[PDB]
Amino acid sequence: MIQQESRLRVADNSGAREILTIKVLGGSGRKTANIGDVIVATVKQATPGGVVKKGEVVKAVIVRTKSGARRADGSYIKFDENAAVIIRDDKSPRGTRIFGPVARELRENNFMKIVSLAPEVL
Amino acid sequence: SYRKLGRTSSQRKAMLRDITTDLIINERIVTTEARAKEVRSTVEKMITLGKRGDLHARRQAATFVRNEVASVREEDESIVVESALQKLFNDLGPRFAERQGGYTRILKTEPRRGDAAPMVVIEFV
Amino acid sequence: KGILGKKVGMTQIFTESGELIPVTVVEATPNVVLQVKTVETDGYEAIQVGYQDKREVLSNKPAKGHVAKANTAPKRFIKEFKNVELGEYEVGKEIKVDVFQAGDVVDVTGTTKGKGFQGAIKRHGQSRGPMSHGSRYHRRPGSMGPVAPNRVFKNKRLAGRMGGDRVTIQNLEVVKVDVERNVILIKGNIPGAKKSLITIKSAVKA
Amino acid sequence: AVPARRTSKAKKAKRRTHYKLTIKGLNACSNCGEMKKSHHVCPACGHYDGKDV
Amino acid sequence: NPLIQELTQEQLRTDIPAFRPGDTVRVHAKVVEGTRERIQLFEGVVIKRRGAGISETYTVRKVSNGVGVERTFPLHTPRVAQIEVVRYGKVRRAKLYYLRALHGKAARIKEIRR
RNA sequence: CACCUCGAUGUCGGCUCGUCGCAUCCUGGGGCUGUAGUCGGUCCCAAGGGUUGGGCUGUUCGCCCAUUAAAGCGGCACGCGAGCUGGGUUCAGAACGUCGUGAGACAGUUCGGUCCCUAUCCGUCGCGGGCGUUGGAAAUUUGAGAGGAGCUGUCCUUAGUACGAGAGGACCGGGAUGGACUUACCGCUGGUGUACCAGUUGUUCUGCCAAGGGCAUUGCUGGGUAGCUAUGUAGGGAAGGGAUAAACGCUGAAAGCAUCUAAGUGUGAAGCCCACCUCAAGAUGAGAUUUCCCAUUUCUUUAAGAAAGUAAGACCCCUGAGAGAUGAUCAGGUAGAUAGGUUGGAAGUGGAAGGCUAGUGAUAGUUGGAGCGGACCAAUACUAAUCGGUCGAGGACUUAAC
RNA sequence: GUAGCGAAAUUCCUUGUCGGGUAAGUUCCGACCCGCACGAAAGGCGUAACGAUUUGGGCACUGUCUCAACGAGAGACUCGG
RNA sequence: CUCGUUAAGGAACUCGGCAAAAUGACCCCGUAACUUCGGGAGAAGGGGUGCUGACUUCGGUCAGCCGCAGUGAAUAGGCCC
RNA sequence: GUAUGAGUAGCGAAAGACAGGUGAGAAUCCUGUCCACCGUAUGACUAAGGUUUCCUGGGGAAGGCUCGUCCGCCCAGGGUU
RNA sequence: UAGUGAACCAGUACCGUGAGGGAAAGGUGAAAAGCACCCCGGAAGGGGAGUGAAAUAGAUCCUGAAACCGUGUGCCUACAA
Ligand SMILES: [K+]
Ligand SMILES: [K+]
Ligand SMILES: [K+]
Ligand SMILES: [K+]
Ligand SMILES: [K+]
Ligand SMILES: [K+]
Ligand SMILES: [K+]
Ligand SMILES: [K+]
Ligand SMILES: [K+]
Ligand SMILES: [K+]
Ligand SMILES: [K+]
Ligand SMILES: [K+]
Ligand SMILES: [K+]
Ligand SMILES: [K+]
Ligand SMILES: [K+]
Ligand SMILES: [K+]
Ligand SMILES: [K+]
Ligand SMILES: [K+]
Ligand SMILES: [K+]
Ligand SMILES: [K+]
Ligand SMILES: [K+]
Ligand SMILES: [K+]
Ligand SMILES: [K+]
Ligand SMILES: [K+]
Ligand SMILES: [K+]
Ligand SMILES: [K+]
Ligand SMILES: [K+]
Ligand SMILES: [K+]
Ligand SMILES: [K+]
Ligand SMILES: [K+]
Ligand SMILES: [Mg+2]
Ligand SMILES: [Mg+2]
Ligand SMILES: [Mg+2]
Ligand SMILES: [Mg+2]
Ligand SMILES: [Mg+2]
Ligand SMILES: [Mg+2]
Ligand SMILES: [Mg+2]
Ligand SMILES: [Mg+2]
Ligand SMILES: [Mg+2]
Ligand SMILES: [Mg+2]
Ligand SMILES: [Mg+2]
Ligand SMILES: [Mg+2]
Ligand SMILES: [Mg+2]
Ligand SMILES: [Mg+2]
Ligand SMILES: [Mg+2]
Ligand SMILES: [Mg+2]
Ligand SMILES: [Mg+2]
Ligand SMILES: [Mg+2]
Ligand SMILES: [Mg+2]
Ligand SMILES: [Mg+2]
Ligand SMILES: [Mg+2]
Ligand SMILES: [Mg+2]
Ligand SMILES: [Mg+2]
Ligand SMILES: [Mg+2]
Ligand SMILES: [Mg+2]
Ligand SMILES: [Mg+2]
Ligand SMILES: [Mg+2]
Ligand SMILES: [Mg+2]
Ligand SMILES: [Mg+2]
Ligand SMILES: [Mg+2]
Ligand SMILES: [Mg+2]
Ligand SMILES: [Mg+2]
Ligand SMILES: [Mg+2]
Ligand SMILES: [Mg+2]
Ligand SMILES: [Mg+2]
Ligand SMILES: [Mg+2]
Ligand SMILES: [Mg+2]
Ligand SMILES: [Mg+2]
Ligand SMILES: [Mg+2]
Ligand SMILES: [Mg+2]
Ligand SMILES: [Mg+2]
Ligand SMILES: [Zn+2]
Q: How was this structure determined?
A: cryo-EM
DSSP C125: -
What stretch of H or E contains B95?
helix B93-96
DSSP string for residues in C163-206: ---EEEEEEEEEEEEETTTTEEEEES--SS-TT-EEEEEE-S--
Point out which residues pair with C176 in neighbouring strands.
C185
Return d(Cα A68, Cα E40) in angstroms, integer.
19
By the 10 Å C-beta count (0-12 exposed, 13-18 middle, 19+ buried), C80 is classed as middle
Which amino acid does the sequence have at D23?
I
Instruction: Calculate helix-pair angle for B55-62, B33-52, nearest 10 degrees.
Output: 150
Contact A120/E65, CB-based, under 8 Å? yes
Closest to C183 (Cα-Cα) out of E6, E9, E51, E56: E6
State whether residue E30 is helix, strand or coil: strand
Within 8 A of C184 by CB-CB distance, chain E residues are none
Return d(Cα B60, Cα B54) in angstroms, integer.
10
CB of E60 closer than 8 Å to CB of E75: no
Contact E11/C181, CB-based, under 8 Å? no
- Which positions ≥6 away from A62 have C-beta within 8 Å? A2, A8, A33, A34, A35, A36, A37, A38, A39, A82, A83, A84
Return d(Cα D28, Cα A1) in angstroms, integer.
70
- Which positions ≥6 away from C133 have C-beta within 8 Å? none
Chain F: nucleotides below 7 Å from protein CB are: 15-19, 50-54, 65-71, 76-77, 79-80, 82-86, 117-129, 137-143, 147-148, 178-190, 194-195, 206, 211-216, 218-219, 222-225, 227-229, 231-238, 276-279, 288-293, 312-314, 316-325, 331-337, 340-343, 345-354, 365, 369, 371-378, 380, 382-389
Radius of gyration of the CA atoms of chain D, in A: 21
DSSP C101: -
Please report, for chain A, the start and end positions of each structural domain, with discontinuous segments joined by +: 1-122
C197-202 vs D26-28, strand pairing mode:
unpaired
Return d(Cα C20, Cα C22) in angstroms, integer.
7
Contact E69/A107, CB-based, under 8 Å? no
CB of C111 closer than 8 Å to CB of C58: no
CB of D26 closer than 8 Å to CB of D37: yes
> What is the spatial order of strands in the sheet that B119-124 belongs to?
B28-32, B119-124, B104-108
CB of C50 closer than 8 Å to CB of C67: yes
Return d(Cα E33, Cα C95) in angstroms, integer.
46
Min Cα–Cα distance to chain C from E111, Å: 34
Which amino acid does the sequence have at C146?
P
- Which positions ≥6 away from C171 have C-beta within 8 Å? C105, C107, C203, C205, C206
Distances (CA, A) of C15 to B62, D26, E62, E77: 53, 62, 29, 10
What stretch of H or E contains E68?
strand E67-74
Which amino acid does the sequence have at E114?
R
Return d(Cα C118, Cα C159) in angstroms, integer.
6
Instruction: Calculate helix-pair angle for B33-52, B9-26, nearest 10 degrees.
Output: 70
Chain H: nucleotides below 7 Å from protein CB are: 1, 7-16, 18-19, 66-68
Within 8 A of A76 by CB-CB distance, chain E residues are 70-72
Return d(Cα A15, Cα A17) in angstroms, integer.
7
What stretch of H or E contains D35?
strand D35-37
- Which positions ≥6 away from C154 have C-beta within 8 Å? none
Residue C136 Cβ under 7 A from any strand G atom: no
Min Cα–Cα distance to chain E from C73, Å: 24
Closest to B123 (Cα-Cα) out of B17, B31, B18: B31
Closest to A9 (Cα-Cα) out of A43, A33, A59, A37: A43
Closest chain A residue by Cα to residue E32: A104
Closest to A22 (Cα-Cα) out of A76, A79, A50, A60: A60
Return d(Cα C108, Cα C49) in angstroms, integer.
16
Resolution in Å, one decimal, please: 2.9
At least 3 CB pairs under 8 A between chains C and D:
no
CB of E76 closer than 8 Å to CB of E52: no
Within 8 A of E74 by CB-CB distance, chain C residues are 12, 14, 20
Closest chain A residue by Cα to residue E41: A122
B51: Cα within 13 Å, side-chain hemisphere: 14
Chain E positions with Cβ closer than 8 Å to A: 29, 31, 33, 40, 42, 64-74, 77, 79, 100
